[PDB]
Ligand binder design. Structure first.
Ligand SMILES: CC(C)(COP(=O)(O)OP(=O)(O)OC[C@H]1O[C@@H](n2cnc3c(N)ncnc32)[C@H](O)[C@@H]1OP(=O)(O)O)[C@@H](O)C(=O)NCCC(=O)NCCS
Length: 440
């Protein structure tokens, strides 16, 4: 009844809020802009004072917030990063580790993102969860804002849930996105602007790639755009379409632009008809402001959003994901390069599967054919590293040189067609490699 009393009972300082987290326990937190900076600074301070140890932190899509606080190299003996999505922050720590006498200082947890709630709650176990939230309303509810992902699950399965109120966090509607005061164990307040995703510049290959993708996007398509420079930028070629839908893992500025233009109506979707579905959002200040109180954008947990069976219920799904390497069988490595983990599988394989199962659906893995100012081919004979998308799941591949649909093709047909999507400079090498491997 008296929510203002409950609020005041639970309101405290960051120092006090983090002071009873146990050593030897498991902590998790929201992704990117949902990482709570005051709480994380106070947690890092505990580690600096030698007052906590053996604390595993399980998390994804790192921001400067955590990079500057609990993930500082000097604390890694006490706060152990268990990243589910490697970023520049972790890649820096890794390099520093190897410089520091070949030390290993970051842990990586492979996963399908649709399984992340189950992994965190049941396989791993999370004792404490921390997340930035929008302010409590007059009915006693906060919102997870840009986050839903696994947060909406782990906030409830965790034994303690600590929130950081920030009036800059948009109030977002969604499944389990609203948090009642009775579900929170402690509150701190810290009003600061959200962290922004950097804007990536286009490269010339995107003109051809975007035109090939545009021809593959049917009427009434239901869009998902993966993380990376390319998907967010490519979907701008769809500004002339109508009645598109959104069912995506990440909501990015490119998709929101299509909403703002009136391209996306969601009227052809079977599930969530009339609303754009996402599990978490990353962008700049303009996007975050636009999400606040939006009645046609609706977050849902990742065990719903990334479930292939759910994705498939909408007709004409179009999934556009990026990769680093494609081999001559159509297997893709989207997460590992130059000897180290670079990112993660994430929800890539979730959406490759879901999109093919959608009636009229298409999964696209798209990439420039080369890297390193044209000196390296992204089409290679054989992946030396982990496979993100196995050859039996890959549907379409697109480069600036065209498209191939791998489903039902023999190994010979796959290799010959993939070779013709490589840059001309590499096709003879690849053909000879295919012969040696007996693909052709
Ligand atoms: C594949 C993925 C890493 C691409 O992200 P990205 O930031 O767009 O990567 P880029 O293509 O720009 O490549 C990054 C750098 O590595 C280089 N590079 C890319 N592929 C390379 C390769 N095979 N060999 C050597 N260098 C390569 C690039 O030249 C680039 O260099 P730069 O720093 O000068 O720009 C990203 O999409 C990802 O993490 N995917 C997995 C998760 C996923 O698909 N989720 C879908 C649900 S959201």
């Amino acid at each position: 009844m008296d929510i203002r009393a409950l609020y005041d009972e639970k309101l405290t300082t960051p120092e006090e809020a983090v002071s009873s987290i146990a050593s030897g326990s498991h902590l998790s937190m929201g992704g990117f802009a949902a990482e709570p900076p005051a709480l994380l600074k106070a947690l890092a301070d505990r580690a600096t004072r030698g007052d906590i140890g053996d604390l595993r932190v399980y998390y994804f899509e790192t921001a400067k917030i955590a990079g500057d606080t609990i993930l500082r190299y000097e604390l890694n003996n006490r706060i152990k990063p268990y990243s589910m999505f490697v970023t520049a922050v972790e890649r820096a720590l890794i390099r520093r580790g190897i410089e520091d006498g070949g030390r290993k200082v970051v842990n990586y947890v492979p996963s399908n993102f649709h399984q992340a709630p189950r992994l965190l709650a049941e396989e791993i176990g999370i004792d404490t969860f921390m997340h930035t939230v929008s302010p409590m309303d007059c009915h006693g509810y906060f919102s997870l804002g840009v986050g839903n992902d696994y947060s909406s699950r782990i906030a409830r399965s965790a034994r303690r849930f600590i929130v950081e109120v920030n009036r800059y966090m948009p109030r977002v509607q969604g499944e389990a996105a609203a948090i009642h005061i009775s579900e929170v164990d402690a509150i701190v307040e810290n009003h600061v602007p959200l962290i922004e995703m950097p804007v990536r510049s286009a490269i010339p290959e995107y003109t051809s790639i975007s035109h090939i993708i545009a021809d593959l996007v049917p009427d009434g398509a239901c869009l998902q755009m993966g993380v990376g420079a390319l998907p967010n930028l490519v979907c701008g070629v769809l500004k002339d379409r109508n009645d598109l839908g959104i069912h995506t893992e990440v909501l990015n500025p490119g998709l929101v632009d299509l909403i703002r233009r009136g391209v996306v109506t969601n009227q052809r979707k079977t599930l969530d008809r009339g609303r754009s579905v996402f599990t978490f959002a990353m962008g700049q200040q303009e996007m975050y402001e636009y999400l606040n109180d939006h009645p046609a954008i609706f977050s849902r947990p990742v065990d719903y959003v990334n479930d292939p069976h759910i994705i498939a219920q909408n007709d004409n799904v179009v999934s556009i994901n990026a990769t680093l390497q494609i081999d001559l069988t159509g297997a893709c490595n989207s997460e590992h390069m130059l000897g180290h983990q670079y990112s993660a599988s994430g929800g890539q394989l979730d959406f490759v599967r879901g999109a093919y199962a959608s009636k009229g659906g298409r999964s696209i893995i798209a990439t420039p054919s080369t890297a390193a100012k044209g000196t390296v081919s992204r089409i290679i004979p054989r992946i030396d590293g982990p496979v993100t998308t196995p050859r039996i799941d890959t549907h379409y591949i697109v480069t600036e040189f065209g498209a191939v649909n791998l489903k039902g093709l023999s190994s010979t047909e796959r290799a010959l067609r993939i070779i013709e999507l490589a840059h001309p400079d590499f096709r003879d090498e690849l053909t000879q490699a295919a012969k040696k491997m007996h693909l052709i």
